[PDB]
Design a binder for this molecule. Structure first.
Ligand SMILES: [Co+2]
Ligand SMILES: [Co+2]
Ligand SMILES: [Co+2]
Ligand SMILES: [Co+2]
Ligand SMILES: [Co+2]
Ligand SMILES: [Co+2]
Lengths: 243, 249, 245, 250, 225, 239
């Protein structure tokens, strides 16, 4: 029932008349913002892209114009995830208390602009369930093979991780050492390794590279060491296991 | 004539047949045919067929299913046992023929059982195609790669499997009997080396010796995987896992 | 503003120009201009021009001829005498002026001889005998890739070529022999799998500038690059420990 | 002035002491002292002592036993639990002091229980030593690093454990409690890396992180062992095995 | 205890090959029995290198021994020429039967070899070799050429010399520890795994050279030595 | 045999009674200095170590101490090779007028202290080479005499780093000399920094270039600070 899953999907869209969509630039939320724009109009849809200290200023700037390209009045809001004790200390369920802090902000924008629901692209209770979010994609049994299909069906051609992963569970995130990691990875991205993570270990940086790249990386050893040392690490290391 | 002449000459035969079945691969030729047939005849008069066999990679097979689902074509999968044919099993210089002959003979059955007037494929400007009643609709309109790349870009086609991996028989010397076992022995080795970050690789079969052909630029990057590839391909049945000092061919 | 807006400003200026001549080189920026001009003014109001010269590789020229015909453009090939200018042959800091003047003035002649309102080229933010129509719409390097993805453009020269005169010191006169000596050296290295490379000329010494990421991969070709470039006239073939600039 | 005048001063104190106990550490300086004591006093009035402990490798210890037996000395080994010292177990910046103090304090027991006039060591002309009394006979005769090599060639001394090893406590940060487990955790890592062909290496301890210091010339050759060094040192208890991008003693 | 067995024999014959074992044995027999009461034999064969012969000949004259060389045709043995896994048996017999003849013709009480009767270890032989002043010895592993060939591959002067030639070349490039494995048209290079990084630059040269020696494919064993 | 080459060596050594040795710290001149001191005594052997612009002040200070360690009456002499016009311009025959400037000093020192000859190592008498001494034997006798320290770095004359006909100066010599010890410091004892005005050409054994990859950026900055505009690695390696 292929076009009958679009039928279940479109059915809920007309029910809400006006929505606020949580835009993440990914293929799923790009599919949601487009379907909301083609069914409810540009004025009954408010796209929101969350900016934070945990995402690269390029990753946020990418999704804002990607929302403008679909022609939706997109609003960017900023979140201090570090304000949550669960996040600042980085517990293993920190993504939950993060996804919760998000939707309540989206629920504010939805309530302040007259939205029937908040839409998105899909420890305690569920993060959406608690905030009253509507994940219309999963409610209609979308698969990985369906979303990629409908994006081509709608003419979608352009579509695009969080820094808490660079830190161990239970290592206090600070405004200082995040920029210490964020700046370190931007350096290694510039040196010719777009896929890299700089793992935090207090006074030790642990550099994970794809093992194919470890050979090409050899020449930058002294320079990466000296640069990341200036950024505050006492020891700059390469994880012998790679990424 | 012009690129505009060739687009209409291409569509001319498309409407002539009303309902078609495309032999879909990941390349631009079969993708341009699948897209143009879908843009002219609709998904209901277009059935894409992706051939599975012991001779081609399951990663390339699963890829062509998705390019047909992403292009919006009612895609059907058929499976081929090339090894049942004596000419293929022995790996003769004409093994590609009896493989291509066994292939097109299958699609004309699928064409007759789904109501197709012809079978389309991506031949542009060998005999086995012109024997089973197969239309090379691109070649019928004098399409060149400069025309196929031009018209595919015009339709917005940017995504296609560029790695048109040769037939796995190429990993074997001429006259080395292909078996269900040693064919999978090659596929597993190459899939591993492809998984490690080297998309261009061939594992040549030489009885108890594996010969790895890698581009010479990449051998610097490959140093780190030495111990693992040896032990891995040894587990896959080779007594010796070696790197060809000469690189790719 | 949005990418949706910069596209309007582009077509807006194109309708104002009605008929144009695009200076096609093969890079992603000039590829975007040739396609947008054909999709706004048609095949008959767009003349693509690919300039051949001694300072650029006969391979980079052939790419832009086929890439222009592949986009469906009336492609014209012109041949240029950069060395015919005294200021360039001796390789002074003024080579860029008298080279670009000869280029734009050659195309400005085609413009009057092919009936174009202007000559267009691919210049982005970050001479004026021609219109840089992308910078007028404030396109950046990240936006050109964005509009190229929207239009389906897949063939473009991924390594931006450059004038061969940079390989020689300022004030070392270029000759047809030492020019080809460098070009042939780079063409060999290009064939081995290093598309971004420069062979810097220092008389009997070749200085190879390679991206520092690649130098590890390059170890295996050492003896061959030496032996080939030695046969091409260099007494010493060396790798610059500093890499590409 | 010359060497042959210091070799005089060296022999002078040796006959003066009649019977001595030498602290042999396999190094070039301690090899010269044990040899000169055997040639001046005879084998029966000289006892060489080589300490086995948790701070030096069970592999490096056995060699100094072979160098002492090969020089023709009655070598007796004593074992010390440095961790029994409150200051060493915590690895304070002064742990070297209370460690060398525990060293000389043991030797003076062996010297008093076998009848020696002094304790000898190879300290030469290059702070807890003499508060137990050990005499630096080479340094007392103004021997230099070039003088020890000169007199060793004169005596036919050619074999010595040139890589004078360091104490395994240097592999740990200041203020990291040493345990019988994590000391062997480092020692086993270093012994593996030595076995693969990198004789000069240190494995720095950082809890769940091993930090591998290799000579930066060697890092190119080391790539092929990446996965094997990682997994072996992981089985030795480390969660993450890393190579210090700054190399040896960064 | 070591010298003790030497005095028992009055006159002995030491088998010098070039390794540290035969170097330590030949010297100690001379220091206990004198230069005239020790007869050294160094084996010449189709299975050994012209340098290993020169290695033991130069080392025996330097240690002060009356060195005698005999030559053996191992390929003449049916088990070796086809090289079955028991060729080492048919190989070891042709050697020892030759030495038992020479011992009677030089007035020797025994024939010596690399040693095991005195519980010498690899760490112990190195101790007496430095103690006895031995500084010249074949530091490169001397070995029989049959190991480069699979069990059951007919050895010929052409394909044996085909293998032997590759190893001397690679040893010249700066890799003294190397074996070149024969597989008809495939050469398999065993190199110490640390060196494979250093070996990278010689790839094309080793390939082109070893192709000239008759191999269709020159390969590096990913597992090394 | 070998034990003959030593008795033949002493035979020629006593025939000369008193000698002057050209010590260059290498093992060969070390074997000569030990055997001559052990046959004639410290008072009948004068070791001479040459200081000049063409060898490193580090190789000189090392060779001085190696003579004092073997117990030899060591005298230091200074040579002005750059004062020789044939050397300063580095002509293809500059090697000749250099070897003559060297031995002419040593033949003077021999006569002013009463030496019968000037001695040197190889394979002015050359007693080692005169006795059919080989490279495998010289290392053997060094262990026999108890010799363990010797400069296994036969640092050739620095004139080879400059093309023929490039005037050597005290300044550009130090530009080359300092560049090489830096490269020696990183772990490559066999290396040459070839001078080409604003280009340095680094010769490394092709085996070592794999080991060399990581130091690329650092070698550039140091040698650039030392005056080279471009620091390069010779793709052809050593020789
Ligand atoms: Co805060
Ligand atoms: Co079957
Ligand atoms: Co690479
Ligand atoms: Co205890
Ligand atoms: Co002067
Ligand atoms: Co190396």
């Amino acid at each position: 029932t292929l076009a009958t899953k679009k039928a279940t999907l479109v059915a809920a869209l007309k029910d809400l008349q006006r929505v606020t969509v949580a835009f993440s630039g990914g293929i799923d939320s790009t599919l949601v913002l487009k379907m909301a724009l083609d069914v409810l109009g540009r004025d009954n849809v408010t796209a929101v892209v969350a900016n934070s200290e945990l995402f690269t200023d390029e990753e946020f700037d990418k999704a804002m114009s990607l929302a403008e390209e679909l022609g939706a009045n997109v609003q960017g809001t900023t979140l201090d995830y570090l304000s949550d004790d669960h996040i600042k200390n980085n517990t293993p369920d920190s993504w939950y208390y993060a996804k919760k802090m998000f939707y309540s902000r989206l629920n504010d924008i939805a309530a302040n602009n007259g939205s029937a629901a908040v839409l998105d692209g899909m420890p305690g209770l569920k993060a959406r369930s608690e905030a009253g979010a509507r994940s219309l994609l999963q409610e209609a049994d979308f698969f990985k093979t369906d979303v990629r299909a409908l994006a081509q069906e709608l003419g979608l051609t352009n579509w695009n991780c969080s820094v808490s992963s660079r830190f161990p569970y239970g290592t206090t995130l600070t405004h200082d050492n995040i920029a210490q990691v964020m700046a370190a990875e931007k350096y290694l991205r510039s040196l010719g390794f777009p896929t890299v993570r700089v793992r935090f270990h207090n006074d030790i940086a642990r550099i994970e590279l794809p093992e194919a790249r470890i050979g090409d990386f050899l020449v930058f050893n002294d320079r990466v060491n000296r640069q990341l040392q200036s950024l505050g690490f006492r020891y700059v290391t390469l994880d012998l296991g790679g990424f």
